[PDB]
RNA sequence: UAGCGGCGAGCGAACGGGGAGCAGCCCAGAGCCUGAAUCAGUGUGUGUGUUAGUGGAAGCGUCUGGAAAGGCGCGCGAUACAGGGUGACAGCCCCGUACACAAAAAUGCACAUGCUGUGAGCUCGAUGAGUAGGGCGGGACACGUGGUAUCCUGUCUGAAUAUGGGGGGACCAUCCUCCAAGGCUAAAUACUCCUGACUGACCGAUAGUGAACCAGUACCGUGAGGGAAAGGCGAAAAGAACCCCGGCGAGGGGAGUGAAAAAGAACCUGAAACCGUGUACGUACAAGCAGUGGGAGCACGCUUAGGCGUGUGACUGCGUACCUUUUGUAUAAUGGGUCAGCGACUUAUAUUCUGUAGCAAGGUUAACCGAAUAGGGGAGCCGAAGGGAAACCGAGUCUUAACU
């Protein structure tokens, strides 16, 4: 299975097991959901009846008053009372099997090929760290929303794509499943494809 | 393939029980606990093995046996693990190098489990009447 | 993720209050009382879709009995007559013709007597 | 809502004793 | 936290190959003279835990 | 897990392995040589932080509107599209932001260099006694006195002190290993009253702190102590000149302001219970869960001049609320005056079963490393073999002298 380039008009060889396997939606879903869950901060709490500020004094005597029996002004039944099942800070992170993560990326990268969303180029850089230069290069290569993976994280290209919200620039080791789906197009350098293959196998 | 076109596999995500949310749900009111008694109560239920006061099974039956400390430092080696070792010679350190038995194991035994089909030198290991007949057959050697 | 119940709770109570329009006192104003009244209105409605079929047949038979006796025959014998004459015109239509076409009913009664005699 | 209930106050009549 | 084994149960039940549990018979501790040899002989070998009892045993021995 | 355990309820190691971090020294002493290593103050220079700050890009026309940041058109900046504000939603209006700069003065840290104290190195010697150990009583060790090692000591005792002594889980021998009865020592670890920045599938005024508000206040209590309620006019006060009724009132009606005053300060929205005014229909010979099925008449509105839609409902069939609890409730058993808001199967970690996904005789890593949701890390865990109390044997094994 041979990928084709647009800038140089050449052929780049790739593994059939990495860029030419069927889309395992169920597997990709689990990894995407796991990634979103990994992004959660999980920083919150409410006060149980134990934590709400006030005395343990029984508001009124058990019997004789003619009112519902009360034990604590902190009862969750009461206004200003505890939350019955007060939240604690949680870790929402999920375990993703190494093989289930790699198999998910393989499924995603394979879809990007068939949907013609993966563009392969020999070299992708700009002259100086100027957003105007990259912006111009993207309205020449004919894409607005795009994810750029490059071999060495060139400082100029990184800075030049920082103020463009629809454009993101990363290395081959910094690819994530969500970013390979979220972005309309993915523009990978020749070196990147020779780093991704070796990382997935 | 978009973030709003990904579905989980059919039946992979079953909706959890929500007790005490009305008649329609079928878990209304009592929330599947029934009427009254210890088991309907918050934190209600008897401990494991409790039979209602009747001398429980793990008490009316006698204790037996003792735990062997020697058993804990004795391991069994199958035949398929004789190929996994790096060298060809199956000593009581090469089995630890290749992670077949534990670091604390002082006694190992080769038994008839799997098919060994390579010449193997088993040294300082007890070997079964089927193992000595399977290793030697493939072209192996044994010494105490 | 805290959920306020106000908007949904309001919608549910209003839906019941709307079905309780025309009911007396608390039954058209007070949710607790209106809910019971709408359920009971429903129970009766379900019961009376069956009773309606009983009450209307009861009414048809009463009228056929009347218009047959004016022609000089009981209901019991008139229907027996029609069945022997192989007349399959149902009581709803008999009752309707007994009121609106007394000449046609007399014709049915004549066929009744003929089947008996 | 409801106000905090009163502590016991003098009672006019003894509860009848049934025994 | 980890479930705790009912240690008394662990001293009286061993898990077999197919998942059942072997146990020692009761009535062979003392008062042996009045008991027939046949009865005592049949009480010597280990027996399997019955179907009705398995649930109770498995609860007590989560790491069996 | 091994153990401990009215062997109950429960309690619960260690060895060893993987990591973070890593550092060793001094006195119990005399002499030689000299103050030579190094930690501490002490000023003095050097950088680099902190405590004020400085500069900081780029937009106009038109349409709707009270107002434009919105729509539409055509431009421009971007190492700056973090965020906030501005009469509705602004990269280019404002404050910022990226980025680049800044200290008279004080102070932190890290190097450099004088001063003061401190004493290295080498040779020879020394090697912590009411102590170890013991008896009695307790306590601590996962270990409840048990067969119970080991540690601590209230009480009574009491060694050997290197040719010696401690430990190796009763105890003895052998062997191995260590040197008590003197002391010092960074890092990895714990915590946040408090300070700055930043973040949230955290709350949004009965929530979130008790407290968004002059709240630990009002108020309660002799006192310790307890402890509320209460947020929002508008873009801008432009917060209503003046006139009129009224008590030189309250309150209101005009006028004027505003996009809006049914935004008028008792102010965004303005639900429900609850209370009224108006209109239509019913209702003063009529018995009960108040509805429901049938149904006349009247009023109103229509898109056949006609049926149909709406409101009412004479008369009539049927008909004893709801919840709870019960063998069974119209029950004269329980609970609810009504409305609105809140109010009850959760969370963590283990374990088992089901579904689903991956991989498959393999599967998977934990801590941790890594800026890395990657990658590394396979320490471990589960499985591929069982039988036996166990030694042990092993597709068998146990039982038994041996099994048909
Ligand atoms: C009132 O009742 C109380 C009990 O609650 C005492 O019995 C008291 O004595 C009573 N007083 C009278 C006057 O009967
Ligand atoms: Mg609260
Ligand atoms: Mg990992
Ligand atoms: Mg049910
Ligand atoms: Mg109940
Ligand atoms: Mg009961
Ligand atoms: Mg029950
Ligand atoms: Mg409780
Ligand atoms: Mg290992
Ligand atoms: Mg909310
Ligand atoms: Mg109403
Ligand atoms: Mg109330
Ligand atoms: Mg015995
Ligand atoms: Mg500026
Ligand atoms: Mg405009
Ligand atoms: Mg507005
Ligand atoms: Mg010493
Ligand atoms: Mg002592
Ligand atoms: Mg002793
Ligand atoms: Mg000692
Ligand atoms: Mg000893
Ligand atoms: Mg020993
Ligand atoms: Mg509050
Ligand atoms: Mg509000
Ligand atoms: Mg006071
Ligand atoms: Mg006035
Ligand atoms: Mg507003
Ligand atoms: Mg208002
Ligand atoms: Mg109202
Ligand atoms: Mg009348
Ligand atoms: Mg009368
Ligand atoms: Mg009456
Ligand atoms: Mg009736
Ligand atoms: Mg009863
Ligand atoms: Mg009844
Ligand atoms: Mg009764
Ligand atoms: Mg009642
Ligand atoms: Mg009554
Ligand atoms: Mg009761
Ligand atoms: Mg009551
Ligand atoms: Mg085994």
TrEMBL record, chain C:
CDD domains xrefs: Ribosomal_L20 (cd07026)
SUPFAM superfamilies for this protein: Ribosomal protein L20 (SSF74731)
GO terms (BP aspect): ribosomal large subunit assembly; translation
Molecular function as annotated in GO: rRNA binding; structural constituent of ribosome
Protein name, per record: Large ribosomal subunit protein bL20
Keywords of this entry: Ribonucleoprotein, Ribosomal protein, RNA-binding, rRNA-binding
One Pfam family of this chain: Ribosomal_L20
Keyword match RNA-binding: yes
Any one GO CC term of the record: ribosome
Family annotation (InterPro entries): Ribosomal_bL20 (IPR005813), RIBOSOMAL_L20_CS (IPR049946), Ribosomal_protein_bL20_C (IPR035566)
Listed Gene3D superfamilies: 6.10.160.10, Ribosomal protein L20
Keyword set includes Ribonucleoprotein: yes
PANTHER family: 39S RIBOSOMAL PROTEIN L20 (PTHR10986)
Family indicated by similarity: Belongs to the bacterial ribosomal protein bL20 family.
Record's function text: Binds directly to 23S ribosomal RNA and is necessary for the in vitro assembly process of the 50S ribosomal subunit. It is not involved in the protein synthesizing functions of that subunit.
Superkingdom classification of source: Bacteria
UniProtKB/TrEMBL annotation, chain D:
Superkingdom field: Eukaryota
Protein's UniProt keywords contain Signal: yes
Keywords assigned: Signal
Chain intervals for the UniProt region annotation (Disordered): 1-19
Statement: the UniProt record of this protein carries the keyword Signal: yes
Biased composition regions of type Pro residues, renumbered to the chain: 2-13
This protein's name: Uncharacterized protein
Organism encoding this protein: Drosophila willistoni
Portion of the full-length sequence here: 23 to 41 of 56
From TrEMBL, chain E:
Protein keywords: Ribonucleoprotein, Ribosomal protein
Classification via InterPro entries: Ribosomal_bL35, Ribosomal_bL35-like, Ribosomal_bL35_CS, Ribosomal_bL35_sf
Keyword Glycosyltransferase: no
Keyword Nucleus: no
Database matches in PROSITE patterns: RIBOSOMAL_L35
GO CC annotation terms, alphabetical: cytosolic large ribosomal subunit
GO molecular function: structural constituent of ribosome
Domain of life: Bacteria
GO biological process: translation
NCBIfam families per the UniProt record, alphabetical: rpmI_bact
Family label: Belongs to the bacterial ribosomal protein bL35 family.
PANTHER family per record: 54S RIBOSOMAL PROTEIN BL35M, LARGE RIBOSOMAL SUBUNIT PROTEIN BL35M
Name this polypeptide is given: Large ribosomal subunit protein bL35
Annotated organism of origin: Escherichia coli
Gene field: rpmI
